[PDB]
Amino acid sequence: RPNSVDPALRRPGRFDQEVEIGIPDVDARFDILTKQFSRMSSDRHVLDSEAIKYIASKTHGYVGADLTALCRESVMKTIQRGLGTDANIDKFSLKVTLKDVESAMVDIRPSAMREIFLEMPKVYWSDIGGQEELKTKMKEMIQLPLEASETFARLGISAPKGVLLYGPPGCSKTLTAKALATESGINFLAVKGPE
Amino acid sequence: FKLPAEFITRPHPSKDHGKETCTAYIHPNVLSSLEINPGSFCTVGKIGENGILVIARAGDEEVHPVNVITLSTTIRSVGNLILGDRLELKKAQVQPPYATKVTVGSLQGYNILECMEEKVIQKLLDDSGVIMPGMIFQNLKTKAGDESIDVVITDASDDSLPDVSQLDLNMDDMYGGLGSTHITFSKETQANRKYNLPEPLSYAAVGGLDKEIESLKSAIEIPLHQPTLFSSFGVSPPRGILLHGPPGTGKTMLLRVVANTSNAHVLTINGPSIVSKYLGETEAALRDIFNEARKYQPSIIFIDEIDSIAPNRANDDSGEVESRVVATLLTLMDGMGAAGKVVVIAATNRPNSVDPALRRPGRFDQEVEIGIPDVDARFDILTKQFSRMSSDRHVLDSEAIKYIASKTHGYVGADLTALCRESVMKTIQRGLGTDANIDKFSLKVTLKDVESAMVDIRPSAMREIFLEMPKVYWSDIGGQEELKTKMKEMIQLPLEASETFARLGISAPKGVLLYGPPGCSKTLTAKALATESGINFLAVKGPEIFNKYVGESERAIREIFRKARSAAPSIIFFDEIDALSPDRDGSSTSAANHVLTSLLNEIDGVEELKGVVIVAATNRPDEIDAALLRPGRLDRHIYVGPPDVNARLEILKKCTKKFNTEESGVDLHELADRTEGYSGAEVVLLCQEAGLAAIMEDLDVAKVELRHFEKAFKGIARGITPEMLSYYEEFALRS
Ligand SMILES: Nc1ncnc2c1ncn2[C@@H]1O[C@H](COP(=O)(O)OP(=O)(O)OP(=O)(O)O)[C@@H](O)[C@H]1O
Ligand SMILES: Nc1ncnc2c1ncn2[C@@H]1O[C@H](COP(=O)(O)OP(=O)(O)O)[C@@H](O)[C@H]1O
């Protein structure tokens, strides 16, 4: 945490260079899982890539450190399910499956739920709920700046940079931000009032 | 100039025959420093327990390191000398006088060894030294039918002049080839209780957590016994194992059991003695301990009270012991080796107080959870204990054990052991007082002393609780089944469908609210919920958490919530939440707002509490803050109005049960019909005040008259107006 560090250290004159590392997104998690599978080699597992995307999607707030522990506990679950059932049968045939991974992600209980910044929430347009006019308007004002910043700079008008939403406390006021974050693929900041 | 200080035991390598009793592989420098002939006896101090196990000595071949010493598995089992202990050396004592009888016990066998006997005596005493009270050897090869046999030789019939020698070792001079002293095989004797030998803790001694202990044993056995198989995967085996639970569950006992039952090296810490004033001394000691740990491949690490050794840095950064020790232990346990075979067992009373850096999937992914024993576990513990001191000293049938277990539902294994000890000592005291020095075998153990024992000892929680044993039951209360059908399912959801919630992901809202008019049955409903649940109940009320000091309310809230979390899945109840619910109305202080925000965050904020269930009771739910009156938390609302005709009749009959109905002159229905607009508390008080009116005449009476009831009705007021009932109804309509 740079905040706990003395601000004298965080001086541009000396410590100008800064590198920011965030929690992996869906693509980074998929790449990490594929690299781990390649490292542990195909002779010890039978998996397909669609299951890798499914696992990456199912992990929203998971950190990169959690994936290795999940793989290790899945290995333990497979070893136990082989031993205690088949009375010390050969482990080569059992290799790696999906049920152990599912049990591992159920019982892992990660401690990364509490955070001030969530990176790339996953929700698709086939899951959200809203009205057509709101979706069209949000598409219009997300496609205006990111695709016409140079045009606005040439015209010297910039972008409104302000959108206000008000409605019933049911839905279509909070999940819309997550939908926009998932669709646009741009960094998303969520701030809670009482927090 | 070597100056040896402390020594560590080790099993004898290569097996075979060799010495097997007096190996004592020690560098010749230590032999010369002790000024004693190497071809003589040696001693192992082992700190305390005088007797020092005087065994003969032998020299090594100059490669055996000075620090480590070999005591052989036979002596290790004889004296319960576990691996990693500290030992001291001193001059030998006087030579043993002689051996008189020596008698075998035929451990865990049906005896009848004559077919496979083959002159066991030569096999027993083909060795130098050999302390008579202890010989434990492998079966080796005995005729056909292989199998395994062990012998108990603890019992002895001789005495030695010095009281220091605890096991009174004896010399050997008999005859054997490849006749004794009046034979040695007689009876299947167990370990002798006269000398009070330290009984090894068997793996079957602990019970009621068979699934948990089996999972822990497998999780610690698969890395050690299968290191290559796990290393083939390339994911590497973790070293951290977390043990936690309520106090008195016996986690230290199971740690001792697994240490004794494992032949691999075990290491444990002796508490805060490692912590010292010098900053570098503790680091050097930890580094040396870790070095000795991974120097030998099979090693077990035992950690106790990790919460005190490694407190949370955020909670209190007092200094000295701080996050630096957490970091150094994490670095030490991160990379001792690639595959290796190392497991670390950490026991903590409060997992929350532990540093969250320790509680991470990268270092402590595997956790073991221990809860309060249930009826079956307590019954198993009691049966094990009774088998432990044998039926020769007590008589108790299975139904009696089940009844005792059912009566003591809030106890723990430590509580049961203390109950047995207090029952034994009270029985001894009663026998001494009454029977005038009778043999203790005749009186043995009965039921009355044990019942008085659980009556007197009281549960170790030392907090006020109904416990459902001496308090109101379901038969004593007559109400409406409509709310009962709801609450039974509502509180059977979490206790019975935790796996269903985990699999489906629906989980539990954990929010239930009960609103009732003053004088109605609201606390009665809470008591009924607690009774039917059969789980520990915490009696918490609104103003109780409030205090004059600023911030004390938050401390009390955190205390009660971490107590409820560690008190198994239960229900937390607030008697009067109306004292803190309204903040906008009445100009509440900042403390009330802070408490409301804290409880809002605790119920369904940032974290979810699967174990406990939150139930709240308010005198008036219309002034509650809109933040709490939100769907998802405390959403369920039950009107639970005044008792109807049948409930009022049942309540009157229960009150009249102490009286006599035949001579009362009432039909138990006219009174209920007349008393229809009164509150439940007023209805209950009506019977008592009418009884007072009846006894007004001549103190103690046996007859009640209608004039007394009329005077009772005239002299009291309901105190309930239709306006508040209409307001309560409007609360239901508006929601
Ligand atoms: N379930 C049980 N069955 C039989 N005896 C038990 C049980 N639980 C406790 N005991 C007895 O109580 C003693 C206390 O156990 P132990 O020292 O392991 O306690 P603990 O819960 O780990 O707590 P602490 O570390 O404070 O001692 C045991 O040595 C044993 O004699
Ligand atoms: N049938 C009954 N027998 C004995 N006591 C009762 C009975 N019904 C209710 N009570 C008592 O009346 C009290 C009800 O409190 P209640 O009036 O609901 O509080 P509030 O006024 O905050 O709503 C309980 O504490 C309970 O002990």
Curated annotation (Swiss-Prot), chain B:
CDD domains per the UniProt record, alphabetical: RecA-like_CDC48_NLV2_r1-like, RecA-like_CDC48_r2-like
Effect of residue 302 to L: In dgr1-sup*; moderate loss of catalytic activity. No growth defect. Restores growth and formation of 60S ribosomal subunit maturation but not catalytic activity or oligomerization
Gene Ontology terms: cellular component: cytoplasm; preribosome, large subunit precursor
Compartments, as annotated in UniProt: Cytoplasm
Impact when changing residue 305 to Q: Reduces basal and RLP24-dependent ATPase activity. Increases interaction with RLP24. Slightly reduces RLP24 release. Does not affect composition of pre-60S ribosomal particles or growth
Sequence positions that bind ATP 1: 245-252
Role: ATP-dependent chaperone which uses the energy provided by ATP hydrolysis to generate mechanical force to disassemble protein complexes. Plays an essential role in the cytoplasmic maturation steps of pre-60S ribosomal particles by promoting the release of shuttling protein RLP24 from the pre-ribosomal particles. This step facilitates the subsequent release of other shuttling proteins such as NOG1 and allows the transition of the pre-ribosomal particles to later maturation forms that bind REI1. Essential for viability.
Protein name, as recorded: ATPase family gene 2 protein
Encoding gene, per UniProt annotation: AFG2
